[PDB]
Amino acid sequence: VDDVTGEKVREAFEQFLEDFSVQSTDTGEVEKVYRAQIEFMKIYDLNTIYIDYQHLSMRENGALAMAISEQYYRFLPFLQKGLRRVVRKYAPERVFQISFFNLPTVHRIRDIRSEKIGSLLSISGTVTRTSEVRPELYKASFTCDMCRAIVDNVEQSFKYTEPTFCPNPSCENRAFWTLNVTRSRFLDWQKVRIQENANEIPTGSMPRTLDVILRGDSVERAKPGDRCKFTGVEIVVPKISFLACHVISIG
Amino acid sequence: LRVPVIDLNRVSDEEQLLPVVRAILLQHDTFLLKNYANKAVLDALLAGLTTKDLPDTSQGFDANFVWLEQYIFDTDPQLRFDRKCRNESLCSIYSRLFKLGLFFAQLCVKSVVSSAELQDCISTSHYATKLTRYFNRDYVTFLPTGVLTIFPCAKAIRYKPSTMATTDNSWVSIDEPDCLLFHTGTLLARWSQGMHTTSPLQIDPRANIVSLTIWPPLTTPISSKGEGTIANHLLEQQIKAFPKVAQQYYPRELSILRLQDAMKFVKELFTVCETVLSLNALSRSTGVPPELHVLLPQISSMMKRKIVQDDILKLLTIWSDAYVVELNSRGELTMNLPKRDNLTTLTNKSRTLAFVERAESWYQQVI
Numbered sequence: 001v002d003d004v005t006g007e008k009v010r011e012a013f014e015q016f017l018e019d020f021s022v023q024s025t026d027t028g029e030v031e032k033v034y035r036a037q038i039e040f041m042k043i044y045d046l047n048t049i050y051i052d053y054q055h056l057s058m059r060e061n062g063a064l065a066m067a068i069s070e071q072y073y074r075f076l077p078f079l080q081k082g083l084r085r086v087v088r089k090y091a092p093e094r095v096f097q098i099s100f101f102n103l104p105t106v107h108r109i110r111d112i113r114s115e116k117i118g119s120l121l122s123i124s125g126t127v128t129r130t131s132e133v134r135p136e137l138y139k140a141s142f143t144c145d146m147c148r149a150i151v152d153n154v155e156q157s158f159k160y161t162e163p164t165f166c167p168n169p170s171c172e173n174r175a176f177w178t179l180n181v182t183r184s185r186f187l188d189w190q191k192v193r194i195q196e197n198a199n200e201i202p203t204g205s206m207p208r209t210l211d212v213i214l215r216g217d218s219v220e221r222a223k224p225g226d227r228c229k230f231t232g233v234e235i236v237v238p239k240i241s242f243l244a245c246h247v248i249s250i251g
Numbered sequence: 252l253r254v255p256v257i258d259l260n261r262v263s264d265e266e267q268l269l270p271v272v273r274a275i276l277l278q279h280d281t282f283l284l285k286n287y288a289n290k291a292v293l294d295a296l297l298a299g300l301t302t303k304d305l306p307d308t309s310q311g312f313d314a315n316f317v318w319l320e321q322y323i324f325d326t327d328p329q330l331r332f333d334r335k336c337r338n339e340s341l342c343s344i345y346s347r348l349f350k351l352g353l354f355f356a357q358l359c360v361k362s363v364v365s366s367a368e369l370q371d372c373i374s375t376s377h378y379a380t381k382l383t384r385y386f387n388r389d390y391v392t393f394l395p396t397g398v399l400t401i402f403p404c405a406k407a408i409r410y411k412p413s414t415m416a417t418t419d420n421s422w423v424s425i426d427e428p429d430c431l432l433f434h435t436g437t438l439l440a441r442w443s444q445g446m447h448t449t450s451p452l453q454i455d456p457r458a459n460i461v462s463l464t465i466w467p468p469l470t471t472p473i474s475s476k477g478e479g480t481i482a483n484h485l486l487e488q489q490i491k492a493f494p495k496v497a498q499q500y501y502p503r504e505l506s507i508l509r510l511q512d513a514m515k516f517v518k519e520l521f522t523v524c525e526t527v528l529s530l531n532a533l534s535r536s537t538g539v540p541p542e543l544h545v546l547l548p549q550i551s552s553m554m555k556r557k558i559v560q561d562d563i564l565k566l567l568t569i570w571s572d573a574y575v576v577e578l579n580s581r582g583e584l585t586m587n588l589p590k591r592d593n594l595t596t597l598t599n600k601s602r603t604l605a606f607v608e609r610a611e612s613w614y615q616q617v618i
Binding site for chain 2 (some may be wrong): 043044045093249
């Protein structure tokens with residue numbers, strides 16, 4: 001039911017990114033700064049943009065933000081495809097990272113339920129331990145058993161996957177394709193430990209900790225032992241982990 | 252480390268070694284000579300120490316400052332040359348090493364097209380030797396100014412980065428006890444069909460580098476490439492161009508009319524600079540904006556000499572149509588490539604040849 005809703009929300013997100021330019025001279029009227037942000041990153045090509053949720057909450061009387069807010073993992077490739085189409089039309093080795101920040105509500109680690117699985121969340125606390133960065137497979141280049149044909153396979157952040165059918169009808173087998181690392185983009189993957197703050201611990205309870213995953217260029221910014229606030233998506237790991245996209249040194 | 256070792260008790264009749272010596276200079280061009288009769292005259296190098304009384308004027312000791320007396324010893328019967336110091340013990344070692352030099356000349360310059368012209372020190376006695384006495388950073392790379400030079404030394408070996416012997420572009424050094432080292436000049440490298448090399452020298456433990464050269468004539472007929480330029484004038488220009496000259500008019504005139512030909516240390520920058528910017532073109536899809544702080548140690552590690560903005564300013568002065576001098580908003584100099592492709596080696600070879608031709612036209616019009 002979201003196959004025709006994804007293109008509509010992709011059109012709505014690209015209309016939000018297309019209809020807002022910069023008219024911020026003399027502190028007059030306000031309009032969003034995204035096109036100049038893309039024009040500034042055109043030289044550096046990092047593509048690790050920051051989109052404010054408070055600036056996104058004014059369109060469709062907040063209803064566009066509430067529909068994206070619960071189906072974020074189901075609408076994320078449509079959002080990155082709309083971002084790719086607007087930077088393909090406004091500008092001429094391609095990785096993308098869309099980060100959301102400044103949520104109006106700060107949630108603790110003890111109020112996490114299973115009703116927010118796949119939705120976005122703001123988690124604040126203190127970092128206990130850190131894991132050295134390692135390459136994330138993301139997408140790989142599989143070669144066939146007889147075709148020797150390249151296939152660009154997209155992982156789903158769960159475990160080492162494998163295709164099913166060869167696209168070229170020269171073969172229809174299901175035996176073991178071989179992995180290839182040349183044509184497979186890799187993103188640094190870090191796993192840190194977040195824990196409950198000392199001022200919001202219940203009486204007699206234990207400060208329950210949890211592991212949060214992080215990719216893109218949000219890694220190597222979080223300093224150990226500092227109060228931190230993350231914004232990301234609740235992703236299950238075969239355990240309920242987290243994926244963050246925004247880092248800040250609060251406190 | 253592989254230096255040829257021969258004996259001297261059986262080559263005294265001169266009938267068994269010429270072919271082997273000719274064969275051995277095809278790969279190894281630094282010869283070692285041992286076990287002579289100079290075991291009591293070689294340690295008598297303490298006589299000529301503190302004279303210090305006459306000016307230079309291209310003859311005798313260029314006494315430059317208590318640390319160096321470079322005796323450019325001129326010959327006796329040639330015109331414009333007259334030099335006589337005391338040097339008794341040095342006359343005895345000059346006689347023995349000059350007989351040793353003529354011995355090696357008769358056994359090794361017979362395998363070339365002319366075996367009577369290159370030894371013309373037997374008749375006219377044409378010798379201008381380098382007695383560099385370093386008595387109580389250093390000098391430039393010194394090749395032998397003659398065509399054959401045998402010298403007593405301590406280590407006497409180094410290697411500048413180029414395409415020569417021990418081609419690994421690093422300074423190599425071996426140590427040798429109680430022997431003599433032979434090295435030939437650059438005129439014998441043009442006389443023999445490409446079988447020689449060069450060797451840099453510095454302050455050795457036996458600091459008195461007594462370089463006794465063969466020093467070819469004033470009117471020796473060199474072939475087609477050097478018929479107009481004689482051995483005497485060209486090598487005298489090299490002799491007066493390497494150390495500092497402040498005594499008289501003419502070598503200072505040769506220094507101000509010859510030391511502005513130093514484009515080979517900056518135009519060679521043009522043989523490597525585009526390579527690295529192109530290496531930045533095949534790796535940074537950032538539109539290649541460069542930073543001076545990241546391009547400076549790259550070329551400073553690629554080239555051991557000092558590289559600062561004077562070379563960039565000289566390259567901007569000689570060729571401004573291929574680069575930009577446009578500054579950014581932060582306040583630093585930026586420079587890019589005007590080609591629409593990444594790089595083409597034929598166009599790069601044509602651009603390097605055009606840069607060489609433009610610098611040669613600048614050298615012609617600057618004098």
